[PDB]
């Protein structure tokens, strides 16, 4: 009986709950901990999309391998974004868009709005209720932005350099006067160029960076092979991977862990950076 809303990533899974609460029935396609860049829609998945009353996804080719299915049946929460909002890099000609918009709280608040207006119009009777829920979460995102700022303000200008497995924090860095390096491009669907590894090594050396970060969606070996190369130039920069020491880029944490919800996933990321960068 409850409306069925298919949802690509754990990100959206959280958002909708935050907004619609228990009023709708959520169909998460990509399990937390998996990588949407590579996810390939299986029969069951396409089925979920088909059976869905509403389908919500990021867009910007984030899902990477379901554009020709989501664009057909679903609504990208990034439909309202404008050109200047976008981050754009280069890759074999073109002007490739950076999908990791959610670390730009403003952009995420935008997404939240689209999601709200789609759950409203899906539940006419719960529209005001949802709008009320939306406002409360918008404000929580507001408070969050202030939290991150105050939290980051403890990291020295010279230490404002983030190193991650791939380019997924451009929107983040842009929001808080940060510089991001990554041995990989915007998508994770490509071989780790050994020339970008070195590029990164030299960047670490240039800026005397003593901490490179690890993420839950990719193999941390890459960052340990990156650490080894640095030391090969002596060279010595810690790898933040340990246990529970992972940044979330392309996914939240499994319900329910510390990176459970979006705002918590955010705080987790932030605290982690300050600890090894401050
Ligand atoms: Zn990514």
Author numbering: 32 to 309
Original authors' sentences:
TroA is a substrate binding protein for uptake of multiple metal ions. The overall structure of SsTroA is typical of SBPs in the A-1 family. The peptide chain crosses between the N-terminal and C-terminal domains only once linking the two (β/α)4 domains via a 33-residue kinked rigid α-helical backbone that runs the full length of the molecule and the metal binding site is buried in the interdomain interface. Taken together, the structural and functional data we have presented here clearly demonstrate that SsTroA binds both Zn2+ and Mn2+ with high affinity.
To obtain further insight into the function of SsTroA, we determined the X-ray crystal structure of the Zn2+-bound form of the SsTroA at a resolution of 2.6 Å, and further characterized the recombinant SsTroA. The final structure was refined to a resolution of 2.6 Å and consists of 278 amino acids (residues 40–317). In our structure, we clearly observed the metal binding pocket provided by the buried surface between the N-terminal and C-terminal domains. Independent experimental evidence has demonstrated that the ion bound in the metal binding pocket of recombinant SsTroA is Zn2+ (see metal content analysis). Zinc is pentacoordinated by His 76 (bond length, 2.14 Å), His 139 (2.11 Å), His 205 (2.18 Å) and Asp 289 (2.20 Å, 2.38 Å). His 76 and His 139 are provided by the N-terminal domain, while His 205 and Asp 289 are contributed by the C-terminal domain. The Zn coordination in our structure is best described as distorted square pyramidal. The binding site is buried ∼7 Å below the molecule surface and the four coordinating residues are also completely buried. Accordingly, our structure indicated that Mn2+ is likely to be the natural ligand. Intriguingly, in the structure of SsTroA, we observed two distinctive flexible loops mainly composed of charged residues, and these two flexible loops were designated as Loop 1 (Asn 126-Pro 38) and Loop 2 (Tyr 279-Glu 285).
